[PDB]
């Protein structure tokens, strides 16, 4: 329910590589290789209680160049398990 912009350093690079790896498993456009993550990187924090504040998890929304094409990837991350899932991977999209 709450959003912020985060940096595009190693953490974000790694998330984008995760997205590329997960997309390559479903392979609905051949096999891709990670080039770069670009700004902006959005991080949504999902809370138990619009009001109350235990964090349930997150979503990251990234712009990722892979095999020279620009994609929008959304990744969920569960707060308790720390487990991540590729939610969607759409593109080519225009540059933000």
């Amino acid at each position: 329910g709450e959003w912020e912009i985060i940096d595009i350093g190693p953490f974000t690079q790694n998330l984008a590589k995760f997205a590329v790896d997960e997309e390559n498993k479903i392979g609905q456009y051949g096999r891709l290789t990670f080039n770069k993550v670009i700004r902006p990187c959005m991080k949504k924090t999902i809370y138990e209680n619009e009001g109350f504040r235990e964090i349930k998890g997150y979503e990251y929304q990234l712009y990722v160049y892979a095999s020279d094409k620009l994609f929008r990837a959304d990744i969920s991350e569960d707060y308790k398990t720390r487990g991540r899932k590729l939610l969607r991977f759409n593109g080519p999209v225009p540059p933000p």
Side-chain angles (χ1 to χ4, degrees):
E2 296 181 0
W3 283 269
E4 73 189 281
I5 299 311
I6 61 169
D7 184 59
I8 51 155
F11 179 69
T12 301
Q13 283 162 37
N14 221 45
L15 276 172
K17 290 174 175 201
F18 174 80
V20 174
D21 285 344
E22 290 300 300
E23 172 69 7
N24 285 337
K25 299 176 183 172
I26 349 165
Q28 62 253 28
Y29 311 118
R31 202 178 10 166
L32 295 166
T33 189
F34 173 68
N35 307 123
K36 195 183 179 170
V37 192
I38 59 166
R39 308 187 181 273
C41 178
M42 269 233 68
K43 174 188 168 185
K44 179 185 180 184
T45 301
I46 298 144
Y47 292 100
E48 185 55 20
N49 274 315
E50 307 298 290
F52 205 58
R53 300 94 60 257
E54 222 277 77
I55 297 158
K56 173 163 24 280
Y58 314 94
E59 300 181 359
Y60 296 97
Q61 303 133 80
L62 288 56
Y63 280 92
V64 177
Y65 280 99
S67 310
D68 287 346
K69 285 171 184 171
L70 182 63
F71 296 102
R72 270 275 290 103
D74 306 324
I75 298 131
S76 61
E77 181 178 309
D78 176 59
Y79 182 90
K80 287 167 201 189
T81 61
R82 297 209 279 140
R84 303 181 159 124
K85 271 157 181 198
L86 178 59
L87 285 176
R88 52 206 77 93
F89 191 99
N90 295 135
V93 290

